């Protein structure tokens, strides 16, 4: 469990819940994702949201779900095993829409950009993770709504963060509104949506899919696992990992943490 | 016939002008526009231009050229009929300016996609079709243009609508300018394109059109439809076209209008 | 020679310094490039920068470096070679960062399109070639960037040119800042890009390229060499280069010199 | 309808529904599915795919269309078996497909998502025999035949070709005689072995990238779409409704003829 | 120089200019297009391509090309030619193409974007006799025969294959006796007529599909650019001034010799 | 440990250390790479690859692998070799790759770039003898091979095929016998050198556009981090553990046995 399906006549939510860890990505609480995903197909309201309760959408996986000593390729299955769950939302007969408030970091920005719509706080922190323990795995999947010169600026400078309505001006959301706004916005779109025949809904999704697919959004996907997979091997990387084992988190995180690349350009008068 | 041609040293303007059905395409209007495309391929001035007459750029296809009876792969072609006409201005040798003021609509909204260079009236209308009869069709070419998520708020809410500013915005028009400078907009620009050699500016356009067959611009066109035609078929989509043998098309209209997503953001203080 | 490296502790830049020739590329120099490029793969700084000494970026390719009399695949295989020199960038194991300030014109624009990251002045004037002599070959680079709108709009004007401002907000730079901004904001930058582990830098750069790839990136330069080298035989492309063998290059600009696109939009009110 | 049998080398996954001729159920592919899951981290370090009796299976169920649901119902049905398949592309085992007897129609799809397919001299690999649909079979077919012979598949109603046919259009890897077809199988599952299982399991990722590249993942993308437009053509349900109301080997007799193979050959 | 023969399973488009071994000509090209757009919806269930008398086609003729009208103009020219090729390719009705004797040049081009392809054993495919050109036709077989014996094919002046050869490679479904290409062709069509037409448009849309997710499309989009940059190359157009001003035989016999295959043959 | 033999129709670069079986260091790799740049321009039209002695290469030698520098250090050093082979891919002249005896590993990598391959029909063409890495050959085979047959050589361990079988898969162009090899390829290049080389250059851009939209080069674009990733493993690093403190013969010997072919053979 870790995560909440509250129903409604126009959308469904399907929320995490986990307010011990931040809504943080458990193994556990990913089954339990997929199978009210799964669920939703044909059960419920015509369109499908996605949010978090309490303080934030999500802070992303659990640490512990790394384990160095099941190897390589097993690392590599793991991390394919959570994408797809995420193209489960993009193959879905449903319009799904993401709803984030407060943080979203790592694994969760991930999901999100498997969404049809995303609807952000304007003060929601999108987040790298905050220490540089694996990479090639979130910003590959933003570069079909960024481009790539932002989602190599994300990528590049660790716990490199946007605020809401930066993502929605770099095109990763459909748009930044109040934080108290964030829900009831979604469910105005949707009891639009809610007017169109189901089949509709599903058949102007798989369509536009095609596009998608047919500009890469599918193979842009198939080496992620892999790559994040080699860098949780390198030597320098696990001595960080290894840091952990002794230290607080703070006093690691803080080691990397900073200013962002957009506070960067502010300051120098952009 | 309801097209015409009208020459000019910088642009030749085809112009759609059936005022009596406000501008929407019929088989023989699009007959005639290929004609005249086919014609400036090697007559005329150097840059092509595509606008309304009267009120507004097109309200889209004829619901009249719809023929349930045909079945459901004859209509496949139609459907495909009408994207390679549009693909015809993608191939052709000049550059196509494609300028729109007023209603820009459904189907017309498609082949504006496939133009080189679009300008639109800061108050233009760009919207889908006003009943959810079809689908799948028109916003998967917006894909390149718009991103995926534009694309897929577009297509989901019913008569879903946007301004020139906004079309703008989001990427489908180079620029939004008033209404009155529309026309001579393009006439300014054509008349410093029109320095360059034909030759030039021919292959200048294959060369970007190559970059973006790369990126997946024909191979998304190649099952849309498919995707029209299927939802053509759907029970529930009958019975709404049903309706239309009976009532006021303003009845059924208005039990589908209403706020589109740009204004939904608005009101929840995008 | 005529380019220059300046070490330093988290950024080496990579200096164009040809101030007799308002920083154009000659083969020579573009050989002593590619040799730097090479050299600091694994050598020095984490983060490499290239930039321009002086009064601009660069002015683009020396006009002597084409030569009519070698032929038409000779040609293609130079302007080909230069292509690659760009994808060295690309293919790079450390981010590489492109500092533009004053003009960068021609196949200089074509070099920055293969950056991670690229910061602009405000001011800087990013152009096409003054005179129409060539094409194809510059503006295709630019359609993951900014769309095929202002692609085409970009490459179907004659010396067309917009600004750093402009720039950013196509999306063909991360950022417009002061001129005097342009060096610190990118070292503010590699500063905090500094603190990952090469090879993160590496692997998420290696694994945002699979993606660009899987959207057409590298397709999409496989025909621009031929594109270009076709046009450099058109004979009125070669009637406009004679016209430099008699008279002043300012003439035979000024034939061509005006109003860019952005400032015929501004003009009617955009 | 299914059943697992366990090996040492190979874990085959077995149809088996004789009333049926092996027919695809949805009740059937459900327990596939559930099987193909459950060995991805379970037994033996590759998995197979067979059918027992006469043949591998003859397909898709008539009953599982039903008209009555809608296209796009239609269309996500008929995706969700392309799904079913996919897993084994996705799977992290080499799958081993052995085909003997008839292979008809979806089954000759699902086969197209094997590593490898061993396939008996004799069999049968056939369209439907009667056109009922389409665009969804063939398609599968192009990235190991070609264009030209799926097309000439595609395009003559009950078209067939036999084992060694397949095997030389590239379809299958090899044919071998019947009684061969299972134990050059667990021959070929006793080599892999050998290699730890991250290999194979990367080896095959890395493969399967290089087929993606080439288009594999979407040339499928609409073929569920092709074949719920052609369950509604007028001509296919006036065919469709022959098979409620006449005898099935009168329909099937109205279609049955010469492959384009036999054309082939007595043509020289 | 192009006629139609009406049939009740096949219409054929006959290439019918003795006079010029029924090279194509802008005129005769302009029909033959005008005819395979009327065939879209009028006549046979099939579509059919071929030659009459000795050959299919020889080719282009040679005066097509205007070394006046500049290298763009010739880019246009030369992609107006793909697009009729392409036609085909699009068309909702199979087309089959039936090669005799001599396919030389861009007829070779054309009969890639064919469906089914039949040849006669006999028949010589020949890139060009002289290498006034080069990246046309070889590129659209890359898809059907792979890049190696694309290549091969190619680097090689006045390199042919024969049917036989063609069948081998893929390029062909079969290769058949001369006397047995037409009625190998119609027999295929009459199994194909028992199929409803709106079957055989999707089936082929479908596969259509599969083969533009592979690149088949996209493979196209310079070959025209490549082609009419090496009509400018100066030792092209040295060659090319041989031909306005010696006999065709002595600069003919200046490239013709073995063929790669004859090559590989005579190496054992 | 590499040599250039000039020529007039071919130049030939010539893997020479017999003392390793023309295996791969850093150091002839950088030669190699040195003389392949270096005709770009200069010399014969045609280039070709070969090995002397009794092979043509069998593969890396093994001290490449550094443990020490870490993983992406391994995935740089092994796309560095991918684009050395690329650039006989990029190259302006035809290039011929003709094989004899062994080709193992990487230098079966190599061969998939070539843009003919000629084969000795004797020649054995194999995978690693030992699971020590994967997914960095094979997937270069697709494009060539297809899927099956590349999946089929890459999941056994040492599996192996003859000239012949590689002439029959698509990897060479033909296999011809051991002592023919060459003079087969010289034969062919002098048919090539009467084109203008202008003319063989584009002709190979325009057919490597057509490879590239059908994914040829982003089929590529992680093969090294598949096979840097398996280096890792356990199992692997336990496997490389044998080698530096048993015999090679020992290693070798307990993973040795029947190819695939050789199994499909058997069973008929």
């Not at 950009?113 to 706080?121: G, M, P, R, T």
């Not at 590959?140 to 709504?145: A, K, N, R």
């Not at 605020?163 to 009891?191: F, H, K, T």
Request: net charge negative; with cysteine.
């Amino acid at each position: 469990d870790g995560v909440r399906l509250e129903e409604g006549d126009a959308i469904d939510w399907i929320v995490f819940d986990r307010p011990q860890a931040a809504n943080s990505f458990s193994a556990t609480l990913l089954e339990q994702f997929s199978a009210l995903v799964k669920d939703r197909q044909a059960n419920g309201a015509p369109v499908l949201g996605i949010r978090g309760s309490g303080r934030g959408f999500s802070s992303g996986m659990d640490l512990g779900e790394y384990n160095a000593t099941s190897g390589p390729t097993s690392d590599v299955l793991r991390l394919s095993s959570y994408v797809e769950r995420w193209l489960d939302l993009w193959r879905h007969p449903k319009p799904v829409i993401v709803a984030v408030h407060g943080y979203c970091i790592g694994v969760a920005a991930q999901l999100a950009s498997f969404a049809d719509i995303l609807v952000v706080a304007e003060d929601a922190m999108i987040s790298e993770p905050t220490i540089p323990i694996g990479g090639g795995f979130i910003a590959p999947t933003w570069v079909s709504h960024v481009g790539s010169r932002h989602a190599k600026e994300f990528a590049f400078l660790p716990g490199n963060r946007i605020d809401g309505r930066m993502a929605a001006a770099w095109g990763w959301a459909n748009c930044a509104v109040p934080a108290s706004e964030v829900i009831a916005c979604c469910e105005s779109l949707a009891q639009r949506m809610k007017l169109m025949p189901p089949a509709v809904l599903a058949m102007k999704k798989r369509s536009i899919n095609r596009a998608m697919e047919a500009a890469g959004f599918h193979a842009a996907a198939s080496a992620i696992a892999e790559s994040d997979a080699l860098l949780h091997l390198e030597p320098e990387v696990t001595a960080i990992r290894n840091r952990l084992r002794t230290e607080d988190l703070k006093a690691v995180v803080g080691s990397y943490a900073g200013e962002s690349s957009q506070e960067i350009f502010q300051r120098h008068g952009g």
